[PDB]
């Protein structure tokens, strides 16, 4: 079972990819500006189960092109 996902990321080779699930990840290093990537995931399902922090928001979904229009936030709190 493979799913096609939206691919908006420097790691992308084309506008879509195929993988085990779809991901939208919003990362902020402590010193730098935040970045957002969209792509496929195949190896580390544990990242999907993690709670969002002030640095990373790792979102996953299992539908075809489910990662296209979803929006995420980051918060220092």
């Amino acid at each position: 079972p493979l799913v096609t996902c939206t691919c908006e990321s420097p790691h992308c080779k084309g506008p879509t990819c195929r993988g085990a699930w779809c991901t939208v990840v919003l990362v902020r290093e402590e010193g730098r500006h935040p970045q957002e990537h969209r792509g496929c995931g195949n190896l580390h399902r544990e990242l999907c189960r993690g709670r969002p922090t002030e640095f990373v928001n790792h979102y996953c979904c299992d539908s075809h092109l489910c990662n296209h229009n979803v929006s995420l936030v980051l918060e220092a709190t």
Binding site: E46, R49, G50, T53, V56
Partner: protein
């Protein structure tokens, strides 16, 4: 200032994995710090490509870079967590969690 193993304590609350990891709350996963300076030691166990790239780097330091100090062997730990459905699962050998040895590659 050379490739070696350093202590690093990982607290799962810091990375947001406390939501699904039940135990342990924190554990010792080492780090490989230091540089790979020629001549490369035996305990580092350098590969043939690492030696070649190092010798080439010495002539062209701006074009080619040095070898890197990375973990060359990983040890597993025991962890109790919850999967996607929430079932409490206990794995005796959660592989790839701790650094056994370092080296230059």
């Amino acid at each position: 200032s050379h490739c070696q193993k350093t202590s690093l304590r990982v607290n799962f609350e810091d990375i947001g994995w406390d939501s699904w990891i039940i135990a342990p709350k924190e554990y010792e996963a080492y780090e490989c710090k230091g540089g790979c300076f020629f001549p490369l030691a035996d305990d580092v166990t350098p590969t043939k490509h690492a030696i070649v790239q190092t010798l080439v780097h010495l002539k062209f330091p701006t074009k080619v870079g040095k070898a890197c100090c990375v973990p060359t062997k990983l040890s597993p730990i025991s962890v109790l967590y919850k999967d996607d459905m929430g079932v409490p699962t206990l794995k005796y050998h959660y592989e790839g969690m701790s650094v056994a040895e370092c080296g230059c590659r």
